[PDB]
Amino acid sequence: VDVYGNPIRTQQLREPQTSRLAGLAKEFAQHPAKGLTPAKLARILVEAEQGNLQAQAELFMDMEERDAHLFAEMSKRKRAILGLDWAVEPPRNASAAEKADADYLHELLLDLEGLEDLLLDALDGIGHGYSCIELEWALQGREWMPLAFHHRPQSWFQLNPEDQNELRLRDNSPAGEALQPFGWIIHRPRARSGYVARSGLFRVLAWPYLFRHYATSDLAEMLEIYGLPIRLGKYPPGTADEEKATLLRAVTGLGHAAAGIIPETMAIDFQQAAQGSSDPFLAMMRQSEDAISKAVLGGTLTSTTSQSGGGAFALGQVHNEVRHDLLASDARQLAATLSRDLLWPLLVLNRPGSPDVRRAPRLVFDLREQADITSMAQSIPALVNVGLEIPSAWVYDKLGIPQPA
Amino acid sequence: VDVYGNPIRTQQLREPQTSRLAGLAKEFAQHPAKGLTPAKLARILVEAEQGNLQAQAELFMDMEERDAHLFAEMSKRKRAILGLDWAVEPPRNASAAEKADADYLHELLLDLEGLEDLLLDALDGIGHGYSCIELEWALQGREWMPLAFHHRPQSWFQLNPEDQNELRLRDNSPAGEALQPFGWIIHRPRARSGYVARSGLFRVLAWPYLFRHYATSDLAEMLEIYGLPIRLGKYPPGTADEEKATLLRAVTGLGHAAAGIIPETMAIDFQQAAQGSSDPFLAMMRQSEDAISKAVLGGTLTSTTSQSGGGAFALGQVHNEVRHDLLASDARQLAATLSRDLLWPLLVLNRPGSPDVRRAPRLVFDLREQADITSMAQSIPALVNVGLEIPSAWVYDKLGIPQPA
């Protein structure tokens, strides 16, 4: 059975759960981000907390699509994880059988195509708060294999009315449907303590995105209004409609027309419509950019060039440690969810026996940090000449040099 | 059969699929970018999401043509990949037969002309979200060969009404036509999780492009209006049409005419039409430039000179790591699509047997990063004198020095 203990029946693995819900596949996103206002966004968040995740997911998709800075930051964060080397390792002080099972799973994963896409789809849970991937199973003789990984939009799910922390499909029923065991991979990173609805990172970044959007739109309109000054023409009583239309045409053309003539009984005035500066909008956009960068990557230097020195070394150290521990946390969570959702079904479906869930293999990402080889090379001789016995295994491990074989 | 398992029939390889659709070849792009407004662009995106990819593809082509900064950034990104060395490597722990097949495919690819053009055409999927290249096959005796690679405009395809993730040709039918197996190379890089329509990078960059376009056009008009001030002439009652035309001519000429005379009963006033500055437009254009650079290359220094020091080292490290992992991701995706679409048909059509799809050869790009030879040279002697056995293979591999033969 799965790690959660739910009974597992192999009959349902032959067909995807969503196959019987063809209505979902034909849905088109409604794009709630267009014409968004603070009241509407607050309503969206409140209704999402009560189990209406569709609008929130669509809004998050639009938000990630429409913002270039948030796009770049999220892409950087995800590509940081995508570049890490991974391996499968048996349980602690494992035996020969457990070692063989771990090696077999490692072999299975190394050639498993689409793994990079699987990781990319799973990492969307950092922003959306949860990512669901459906597994398609097939039989190549006596062994079960995941034929393909299909990421499903977050708009397809909701919350259980009796459980705020449990996700369900949308099957036109108030209670939804429970997720099929051995049929989904669910990644739910925990940046904050709380329920699934409130756990998405995009919930924090929603407000700065709206601030930037409003500032940029207002700046664009103000750019549209500069240049020609607004001017108003006056006519005396007894002017006819033909002459008034002529005056309107003349006044409209005066902006691009260098000269014009009117009767002394008429008047036209110029007003300097805009008479403004863009500095407020720029400042607000910079504030939003800095907030988003700090929230996503934990720092701001990585996105913008620092125009100062002296403290650049301490800033670099802080940034490097923040990036390192953020990456470590994300990779550990991703490895945990992968080991929970993918490795266990393979182990229990392809290999004989019923191994304890306690001794199941765990996926591990390579979080080794490059060490300065020169410093170690110069330090070792003095220590060894003193008399200290430094194990060769530790030196190999820190330096990344593989053991002789 | 292909990697996707679809039955493959060699009869259809003799003619291109599009050959029977001569109407497509005669089509001319409609250039939707001219006279573009935010409402029109939003409509274009919305209709593209529903399966109307023609307008979106034409808009993306116009956008890449009309913007010099986006042009340069995309060219830099693609030429980064074009310069990487590549080789074909057999499956893991391969046998003699698999090694021979991989070597034969390597030989076939090395002399295969047009490979650089094939990579260039495939890399357009980064911006457009998908690039389709049609294969022309021929028989030189007993072996099949790709005679030529023909890139087709993205405006020729659409989405399956019953599948938002499946592409089809435009054959004047509502459902289109399914892509012929063994006849196309499809590259669909995945920057974000989502459907094919929303996966294009240009969708993110569309808005900053429009912002820059509007700012530059308004700045150009404002430049046109500076200089001569707008002036308005007045005449008293009883002025004749000849005299009014004369007054209009005089007022029009006063800008470039240093002097003029009019009756004391007439008046002319000067207004200082523009009385403005270009700073708002410059600031908006800089914002758009920075956004595009960050979205494309992950940084801004590579496109503009940094006017500060101190932190230049940390900024350079961040930029180098961002470029490295971005290039690695792009190259890995390109190699995956190439191995899926080009290597497998050659293996199954030119060589005997039916090798497992699991053991198929995979194209690999050279992602080795140059290591400082001096540091390694100075570090090795101390480590070896301590007693550590560092394999010569690892040193050769990191330093790029080939094995002795």
PDB file of C-alpha atoms in Angstrom, chain A residues 24-29 31 34 58 61-62 64-69 71-73 75-76 78-80 82-83 106-113 116-117 120-121 124 145 151 153 156 212 216-217 219-220 222-224 226-229 253-268 270 272 275-278 282 285-286 289 301-310 312 316 323 373-374 376-378 380-381 384 392 395-396 399-402 404, chain B residues 3 42-43 45-46 49-51 91-93 161-162 164 190-195 197-198 201 203-205 207-208 211 214-215 218 221-222 225 228-237 244-245 247-248 251-252 265 269 271-275 277 279-281 283-284 287 290-292 294-295 298-301 306-312 314-315 318-319 321-322 325-326 329 332-333 340 358-359 362 375-376 378-380 382-383 386-391 394 398:
ATOM      1  CA  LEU A  24     -12.175  19.520 -17.689  1.00  0.00           C
ATOM      2  CA  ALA A  25      -9.921  19.131 -20.733  1.00  0.00           C
ATOM      3  CA  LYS A  26     -12.077  21.521 -22.786  1.00  0.00           C
ATOM      4  CA  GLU A  27     -12.004  24.380 -20.254  1.00  0.00           C
ATOM      5  CA  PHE A  28     -10.373  27.703 -21.146  1.00  0.00           C
ATOM      6  CA  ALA A  29      -8.891  30.059 -18.564  1.00  0.00           C
ATOM      7  CA  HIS A  31      -8.149  35.527 -17.195  1.00  0.00           C
ATOM      8  CA  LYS A  34      -7.682  41.882 -16.725  1.00  0.00           C
ATOM      9  CA  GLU A  58      -6.006  31.607 -13.000  1.00  0.00           C
ATOM     10  CA  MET A  61      -1.036  32.174 -14.006  1.00  0.00           C
ATOM     11  CA  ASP A  62      -1.877  35.611 -15.403  1.00  0.00           C
ATOM     12  CA  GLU A  64       3.333  35.117 -13.721  1.00  0.00           C
ATOM     13  CA  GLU A  65       2.712  35.676 -17.439  1.00  0.00           C
ATOM     14  CA  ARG A  66       2.213  39.458 -17.340  1.00  0.00           C
ATOM     15  CA  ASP A  67       5.161  40.426 -15.089  1.00  0.00           C
ATOM     16  CA  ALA A  68       8.654  40.190 -16.559  1.00  0.00           C
ATOM     17  CA  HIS A  69      10.508  40.696 -13.270  1.00  0.00           C
ATOM     18  CA  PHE A  71       8.922  35.785 -14.402  1.00  0.00           C
ATOM     19  CA  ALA A  72      12.707  36.147 -14.396  1.00  0.00           C
ATOM     20  CA  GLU A  73      13.031  35.698 -10.633  1.00  0.00           C
ATOM     21  CA  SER A  75      12.764  31.133 -13.584  1.00  0.00           C
ATOM     22  CA  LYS A  76      16.099  31.756 -11.865  1.00  0.00           C
ATOM     23  CA  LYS A  78      13.618  27.002 -10.510  1.00  0.00           C
ATOM     24  CA  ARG A  79      16.614  26.652 -12.841  1.00  0.00           C
ATOM     25  CA  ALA A  80      18.813  26.736  -9.740  1.00  0.00           C
ATOM     26  CA  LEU A  82      17.055  21.972 -12.136  1.00  0.00           C
ATOM     27  CA  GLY A  83      20.856  22.021 -12.372  1.00  0.00           C
ATOM     28  CA  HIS A 106      18.549   4.500  -9.514  1.00  0.00           C
ATOM     29  CA  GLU A 107      18.900   2.659 -12.827  1.00  0.00           C
ATOM     30  CA  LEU A 108      15.189   3.115 -13.500  1.00  0.00           C
ATOM     31  CA  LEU A 109      15.330   6.854 -12.811  1.00  0.00           C
ATOM     32  CA  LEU A 110      18.489   7.602 -14.793  1.00  0.00           C
ATOM     33  CA  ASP A 111      16.977   6.522 -18.114  1.00  0.00           C
ATOM     34  CA  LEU A 112      13.472   7.727 -17.204  1.00  0.00           C
ATOM     35  CA  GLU A 113      12.666  10.335 -19.844  1.00  0.00           C
ATOM     36  CA  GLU A 116      13.399  17.184 -16.005  1.00  0.00           C
ATOM     37  CA  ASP A 117       9.895  18.158 -17.117  1.00  0.00           C
ATOM     38  CA  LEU A 120       9.845  21.680 -13.638  1.00  0.00           C
ATOM     39  CA  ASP A 121       6.125  20.963 -13.258  1.00  0.00           C
ATOM     40  CA  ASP A 124       5.330  25.324  -9.775  1.00  0.00           C
ATOM     41  CA  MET A 145       6.278   1.927 -15.534  1.00  0.00           C
ATOM     42  CA  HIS A 151       0.779  18.352 -15.291  1.00  0.00           C
ATOM     43  CA  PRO A 153      -3.832  23.173 -14.100  1.00  0.00           C
ATOM     44  CA  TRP A 156      -9.019  21.748 -11.760  1.00  0.00           C
ATOM     45  CA  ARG A 212       3.584  47.879 -10.252  1.00  0.00           C
ATOM     46  CA  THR A 216       3.108  51.433 -15.069  1.00  0.00           C
ATOM     47  CA  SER A 217      -0.361  51.947 -16.557  1.00  0.00           C
ATOM     48  CA  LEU A 219       2.881  56.263 -16.388  1.00  0.00           C
ATOM     49  CA  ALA A 220       1.888  55.036 -19.852  1.00  0.00           C
ATOM     50  CA  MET A 222       0.808  60.217 -18.672  1.00  0.00           C
ATOM     51  CA  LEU A 223       3.323  59.582 -21.457  1.00  0.00           C
ATOM     52  CA  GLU A 224       0.386  59.561 -23.861  1.00  0.00           C
ATOM     53  CA  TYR A 226       2.498  64.906 -22.773  1.00  0.00           C
ATOM     54  CA  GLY A 227       3.461  67.083 -25.715  1.00  0.00           C
ATOM     55  CA  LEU A 228       0.659  69.060 -27.293  1.00  0.00           C
ATOM     56  CA  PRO A 229      -1.050  71.210 -24.624  1.00  0.00           C
ATOM     57  CA  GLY A 253      -5.212  70.739 -35.789  1.00  0.00           C
ATOM     58  CA  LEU A 254      -3.398  73.543 -33.952  1.00  0.00           C
ATOM     59  CA  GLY A 255      -1.271  71.083 -31.976  1.00  0.00           C
ATOM     60  CA  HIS A 256       0.451  69.736 -35.088  1.00  0.00           C
ATOM     61  CA  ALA A 257      -0.242  72.890 -37.139  1.00  0.00           C
ATOM     62  CA  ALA A 258       2.300  75.662 -36.671  1.00  0.00           C
ATOM     63  CA  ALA A 259      -0.023  78.532 -37.625  1.00  0.00           C
ATOM     64  CA  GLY A 260      -3.656  79.534 -37.893  1.00  0.00           C
ATOM     65  CA  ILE A 261      -5.950  82.529 -38.225  1.00  0.00           C
ATOM     66  CA  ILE A 262      -9.245  83.302 -36.482  1.00  0.00           C
ATOM     67  CA  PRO A 263     -11.497  86.356 -36.199  1.00  0.00           C
ATOM     68  CA  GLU A 264     -10.591  88.827 -33.477  1.00  0.00           C
ATOM     69  CA  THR A 265     -14.009  88.022 -31.971  1.00  0.00           C
ATOM     70  CA  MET A 266     -12.830  84.448 -31.258  1.00  0.00           C
ATOM     71  CA  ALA A 267     -10.265  83.315 -28.703  1.00  0.00           C
ATOM     72  CA  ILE A 268      -8.140  80.229 -28.053  1.00  0.00           C
ATOM     73  CA  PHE A 270      -3.408  76.974 -24.067  1.00  0.00           C
ATOM     74  CA  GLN A 272      -0.144  73.025 -20.384  1.00  0.00           C
ATOM     75  CA  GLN A 275       2.918  69.638 -16.317  1.00  0.00           C
ATOM     76  CA  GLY A 276       4.114  66.601 -14.378  1.00  0.00           C
ATOM     77  CA  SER A 277       7.046  64.284 -13.755  1.00  0.00           C
ATOM     78  CA  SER A 278       7.439  60.512 -13.792  1.00  0.00           C
ATOM     79  CA  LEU A 282       9.482  55.189 -11.052  1.00  0.00           C
ATOM     80  CA  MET A 285       8.002  50.572  -9.430  1.00  0.00           C
ATOM     81  CA  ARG A 286      11.455  50.364  -7.846  1.00  0.00           C
ATOM     82  CA  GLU A 289      10.753  45.412  -7.779  1.00  0.00           C
ATOM     83  CA  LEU A 301      21.718  42.442  -5.829  1.00  0.00           C
ATOM     84  CA  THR A 302      21.125  39.347  -7.971  1.00  0.00           C
ATOM     85  CA  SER A 303      18.555  41.264 -10.057  1.00  0.00           C
ATOM     86  CA  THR A 304      20.070  44.778 -10.171  1.00  0.00           C
ATOM     87  CA  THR A 305      23.646  46.029 -10.311  1.00  0.00           C
ATOM     88  CA  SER A 306      24.870  47.439  -6.996  1.00  0.00           C
ATOM     89  CA  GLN A 307      26.250  50.938  -7.552  1.00  0.00           C
ATOM     90  CA  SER A 308      28.535  50.860  -4.482  1.00  0.00           C
ATOM     91  CA  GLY A 309      31.573  49.048  -3.100  1.00  0.00           C
ATOM     92  CA  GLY A 310      33.240  48.501   0.244  1.00  0.00           C
ATOM     93  CA  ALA A 312      30.023  44.431  -1.505  1.00  0.00           C
ATOM     94  CA  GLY A 316      27.885  38.918  -1.426  1.00  0.00           C
ATOM     95  CA  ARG A 323      20.701  31.398  -1.924  1.00  0.00           C
ATOM     96  CA  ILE A 373      41.246  23.339  -3.569  1.00  0.00           C
ATOM     97  CA  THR A 374      44.343  25.493  -3.037  1.00  0.00           C
ATOM     98  CA  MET A 376      43.001  22.561   1.411  1.00  0.00           C
ATOM     99  CA  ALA A 377      46.100  21.526  -0.537  1.00  0.00           C
ATOM    100  CA  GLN A 378      48.267  23.934   1.448  1.00  0.00           C
ATOM    101  CA  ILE A 380      46.836  19.295   4.612  1.00  0.00           C
ATOM    102  CA  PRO A 381      50.662  18.955   4.655  1.00  0.00           C
ATOM    103  CA  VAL A 384      49.709  15.556   8.516  1.00  0.00           C
ATOM    104  CA  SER A 392      41.030  10.234   2.809  1.00  0.00           C
ATOM    105  CA  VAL A 395      39.057  14.881   1.593  1.00  0.00           C
ATOM    106  CA  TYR A 396      37.611  13.069  -1.426  1.00  0.00           C
ATOM    107  CA  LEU A 399      36.944  18.100  -2.960  1.00  0.00           C
ATOM    108  CA  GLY A 400      34.489  16.148  -5.128  1.00  0.00           C
ATOM    109  CA  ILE A 401      37.190  13.695  -6.251  1.00  0.00           C
ATOM    110  CA  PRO A 402      35.670  10.199  -6.624  1.00  0.00           C
ATOM    111  CA  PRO A 404      39.564   5.046  -6.558  1.00  0.00           C
TER     112      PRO A 404
ATOM    113  CA  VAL B   3       9.360   6.879 -29.861  1.00  0.00           C
ATOM    114  CA  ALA B  42      -4.952  41.474 -25.477  1.00  0.00           C
ATOM    115  CA  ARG B  43      -7.477  40.297 -28.071  1.00  0.00           C
ATOM    116  CA  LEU B  45      -3.403  36.807 -27.000  1.00  0.00           C
ATOM    117  CA  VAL B  46      -6.894  35.679 -25.970  1.00  0.00           C
ATOM    118  CA  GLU B  49      -5.112  30.796 -26.426  1.00  0.00           C
ATOM    119  CA  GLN B  50      -8.249  29.406 -28.104  1.00  0.00           C
ATOM    120  CA  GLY B  51      -6.324  27.952 -31.070  1.00  0.00           C
ATOM    121  CA  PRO B  91      23.123   4.139 -23.907  1.00  0.00           C
ATOM    122  CA  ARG B  92      24.382   3.599 -20.384  1.00  0.00           C
ATOM    123  CA  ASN B  93      26.887   0.740 -20.025  1.00  0.00           C
ATOM    124  CA  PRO B 161     -10.053  21.525 -30.619  1.00  0.00           C
ATOM    125  CA  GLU B 162     -10.126  18.418 -28.398  1.00  0.00           C
ATOM    126  CA  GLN B 164      -4.972  22.167 -26.263  1.00  0.00           C
ATOM    127  CA  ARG B 190       9.358  24.737 -21.477  1.00  0.00           C
ATOM    128  CA  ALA B 191      10.254  27.982 -19.718  1.00  0.00           C
ATOM    129  CA  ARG B 192       6.975  27.859 -17.764  1.00  0.00           C
ATOM    130  CA  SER B 193       4.441  25.178 -16.925  1.00  0.00           C
ATOM    131  CA  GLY B 194       1.374  25.504 -19.120  1.00  0.00           C
ATOM    132  CA  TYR B 195      -0.093  24.840 -22.533  1.00  0.00           C
ATOM    133  CA  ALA B 197      -0.066  28.576 -26.616  1.00  0.00           C
ATOM    134  CA  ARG B 198       1.037  30.165 -23.325  1.00  0.00           C
ATOM    135  CA  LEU B 201       8.657  33.570 -24.237  1.00  0.00           C
ATOM    136  CA  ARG B 203       4.168  36.403 -24.611  1.00  0.00           C
ATOM    137  CA  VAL B 204       5.995  37.753 -21.553  1.00  0.00           C
ATOM    138  CA  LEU B 205       7.973  40.306 -23.592  1.00  0.00           C
ATOM    139  CA  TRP B 207       3.971  44.240 -23.121  1.00  0.00           C
ATOM    140  CA  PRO B 208       7.418  45.852 -22.612  1.00  0.00           C
ATOM    141  CA  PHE B 211       5.581  50.218 -23.897  1.00  0.00           C
ATOM    142  CA  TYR B 214       4.622  53.912 -27.597  1.00  0.00           C
ATOM    143  CA  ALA B 215       7.314  55.832 -25.718  1.00  0.00           C
ATOM    144  CA  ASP B 218       5.626  59.824 -28.698  1.00  0.00           C
ATOM    145  CA  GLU B 221       6.414  63.258 -32.434  1.00  0.00           C
ATOM    146  CA  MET B 222       7.547  65.557 -29.623  1.00  0.00           C
ATOM    147  CA  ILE B 225       7.015  69.598 -32.668  1.00  0.00           C
ATOM    148  CA  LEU B 228       9.175  76.972 -34.052  1.00  0.00           C
ATOM    149  CA  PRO B 229       6.433  77.993 -31.582  1.00  0.00           C
ATOM    150  CA  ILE B 230       2.774  77.747 -32.523  1.00  0.00           C
ATOM    151  CA  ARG B 231       1.405  81.202 -33.343  1.00  0.00           C
ATOM    152  CA  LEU B 232      -2.096  82.488 -34.103  1.00  0.00           C
ATOM    153  CA  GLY B 233      -3.030  85.508 -36.209  1.00  0.00           C
ATOM    154  CA  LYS B 234      -6.120  87.671 -35.745  1.00  0.00           C
ATOM    155  CA  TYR B 235      -7.811  90.010 -38.220  1.00  0.00           C
ATOM    156  CA  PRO B 236     -10.507  92.673 -37.814  1.00  0.00           C
ATOM    157  CA  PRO B 237     -13.975  92.560 -39.390  1.00  0.00           C
ATOM    158  CA  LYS B 244      -6.911  86.327 -44.987  1.00  0.00           C
ATOM    159  CA  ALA B 245      -4.997  83.940 -47.243  1.00  0.00           C
ATOM    160  CA  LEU B 247      -2.214  86.540 -43.430  1.00  0.00           C
ATOM    161  CA  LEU B 248      -2.192  82.741 -43.260  1.00  0.00           C
ATOM    162  CA  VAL B 251       1.927  83.448 -40.228  1.00  0.00           C
ATOM    163  CA  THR B 252       3.062  80.127 -41.693  1.00  0.00           C
ATOM    164  CA  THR B 265      -5.321  96.461 -36.617  1.00  0.00           C
ATOM    165  CA  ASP B 269       0.740  85.825 -30.710  1.00  0.00           C
ATOM    166  CA  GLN B 271       2.597  80.355 -27.473  1.00  0.00           C
ATOM    167  CA  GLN B 272       5.659  78.094 -26.948  1.00  0.00           C
ATOM    168  CA  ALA B 273       3.847  75.005 -28.198  1.00  0.00           C
ATOM    169  CA  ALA B 274       5.897  72.144 -26.717  1.00  0.00           C
ATOM    170  CA  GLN B 275       7.595  73.408 -23.529  1.00  0.00           C
ATOM    171  CA  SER B 277      11.266  67.444 -21.733  1.00  0.00           C
ATOM    172  CA  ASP B 279      12.996  62.511 -19.531  1.00  0.00           C
ATOM    173  CA  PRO B 280       9.720  60.555 -19.038  1.00  0.00           C
ATOM    174  CA  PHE B 281      10.102  58.770 -22.377  1.00  0.00           C
ATOM    175  CA  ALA B 283      12.938  56.579 -18.284  1.00  0.00           C
ATOM    176  CA  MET B 284      10.151  54.401 -19.676  1.00  0.00           C
ATOM    177  CA  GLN B 287      12.598  50.399 -17.829  1.00  0.00           C
ATOM    178  CA  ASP B 290      15.974  46.431 -18.390  1.00  0.00           C
ATOM    179  CA  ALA B 291      12.863  44.252 -18.201  1.00  0.00           C
ATOM    180  CA  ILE B 292      13.582  42.654 -21.581  1.00  0.00           C
ATOM    181  CA  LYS B 294      16.376  40.433 -17.402  1.00  0.00           C
ATOM    182  CA  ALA B 295      13.683  38.269 -18.997  1.00  0.00           C
ATOM    183  CA  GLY B 298      18.640  36.814 -16.763  1.00  0.00           C
ATOM    184  CA  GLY B 299      20.680  39.990 -16.260  1.00  0.00           C
ATOM    185  CA  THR B 300      21.261  43.538 -17.443  1.00  0.00           C
ATOM    186  CA  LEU B 301      25.045  44.073 -17.359  1.00  0.00           C
ATOM    187  CA  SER B 306      27.770  49.114 -15.508  1.00  0.00           C
ATOM    188  CA  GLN B 307      28.819  52.555 -14.277  1.00  0.00           C
ATOM    189  CA  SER B 308      29.953  51.319 -10.836  1.00  0.00           C
ATOM    190  CA  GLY B 309      32.561  49.094  -9.204  1.00  0.00           C
ATOM    191  CA  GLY B 310      33.084  47.327  -5.908  1.00  0.00           C
ATOM    192  CA  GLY B 311      30.199  44.913  -6.367  1.00  0.00           C
ATOM    193  CA  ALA B 312      31.147  44.230  -9.986  1.00  0.00           C
ATOM    194  CA  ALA B 314      29.566  39.548  -7.262  1.00  0.00           C
ATOM    195  CA  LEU B 315      27.468  40.844 -10.158  1.00  0.00           C
ATOM    196  CA  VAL B 318      25.768  36.015 -10.601  1.00  0.00           C
ATOM    197  CA  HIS B 319      25.645  36.805 -14.320  1.00  0.00           C
ATOM    198  CA  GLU B 321      26.129  31.383 -13.214  1.00  0.00           C
ATOM    199  CA  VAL B 322      22.805  32.573 -14.657  1.00  0.00           C
ATOM    200  CA  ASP B 325      22.604  27.303 -16.164  1.00  0.00           C
ATOM    201  CA  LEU B 326      20.355  28.970 -18.760  1.00  0.00           C
ATOM    202  CA  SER B 329      18.926  24.045 -19.762  1.00  0.00           C
ATOM    203  CA  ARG B 332      19.649  19.871 -22.718  1.00  0.00           C
ATOM    204  CA  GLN B 333      16.175  20.548 -24.112  1.00  0.00           C
ATOM    205  CA  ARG B 340      13.739  12.114 -29.990  1.00  0.00           C
ATOM    206  CA  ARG B 358      15.181   2.577 -23.834  1.00  0.00           C
ATOM    207  CA  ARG B 359      18.679   1.968 -25.244  1.00  0.00           C
ATOM    208  CA  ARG B 362      21.237  10.408 -27.030  1.00  0.00           C
ATOM    209  CA  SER B 375      45.365  26.408  -9.751  1.00  0.00           C
ATOM    210  CA  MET B 376      44.999  22.712 -10.565  1.00  0.00           C
ATOM    211  CA  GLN B 378      49.748  23.920  -8.198  1.00  0.00           C
ATOM    212  CA  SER B 379      47.214  21.924  -6.151  1.00  0.00           C
ATOM    213  CA  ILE B 380      47.929  18.452  -7.584  1.00  0.00           C
ATOM    214  CA  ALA B 382      50.643  18.641  -2.656  1.00  0.00           C
ATOM    215  CA  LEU B 383      47.726  16.205  -2.793  1.00  0.00           C
ATOM    216  CA  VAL B 386      50.256  13.497   0.836  1.00  0.00           C
ATOM    217  CA  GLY B 387      49.284  10.133  -0.643  1.00  0.00           C
ATOM    218  CA  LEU B 388      45.934  10.707  -2.326  1.00  0.00           C
ATOM    219  CA  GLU B 389      45.430   8.852  -5.618  1.00  0.00           C
ATOM    220  CA  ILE B 390      43.694  11.277  -7.986  1.00  0.00           C
ATOM    221  CA  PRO B 391      42.578   9.498 -11.189  1.00  0.00           C
ATOM    222  CA  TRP B 394      39.274  13.155 -13.940  1.00  0.00           C
ATOM    223  CA  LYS B 398      38.312  18.777 -16.234  1.00  0.00           C
TER     224      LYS B 398
END
